[PDB]
Amino acid sequence: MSMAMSQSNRELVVDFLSYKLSQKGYSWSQFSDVEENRTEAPEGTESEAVKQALREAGDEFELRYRRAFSDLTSQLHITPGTAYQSFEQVVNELFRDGVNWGRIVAFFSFGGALCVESVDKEMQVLVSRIAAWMATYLNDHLEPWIQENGGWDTFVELYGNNAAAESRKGQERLEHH
Secondary structure, three states: OOOOOHHHHHHHHHHHHHHHHHHOOOOOOOOOOOOOOOOOOOOOOOOHHHHHHHHHHHHHHHHHOHHHHHHHHHHOOOOOOOOHHHHHHHHHHHOOOOOOOOHHHHHHHHHHHHHHHHHHOOOHHHHHHHHHHHHHHHHHHHHHHHHHHHOHHHHHHHOOOOOHHHHOOOOOOOOOO
């Protein structure tokens, strides 16, 4: 459908969203509305490099930037019939001054918050729609856009270690006044 490594990028978005789903209290053995999921599971071999880089980079950015995380889910919790229109509103809002470091880094928080709000509303049937539509349009062109070498190669190179680089409060500072 798009790219040859689509399975790798689709697995990354689905891995963070699958980890957060269970982190709230979701068990695969809970049978939550006849839930099982079994068809070409993720983790083709290792995927531990990027998984650890996303968990460390996303834990630090979420723990240092939980301000907009709440406003994101508080503006678009979950609808009974999501669409591209809703996805365009969240993307156009984050794309106003944030790409990759803010669009993607915050996207993991948007997909995890929308998934937990649907499962609690019995709307888990839409979680596969929002997760596929978001993971598709993301890896489609949003992956090769900036995540190409400045994301996959940057995350594997730095090991997804971005704590002080995010806060931007540990540089030379002092520009005016």
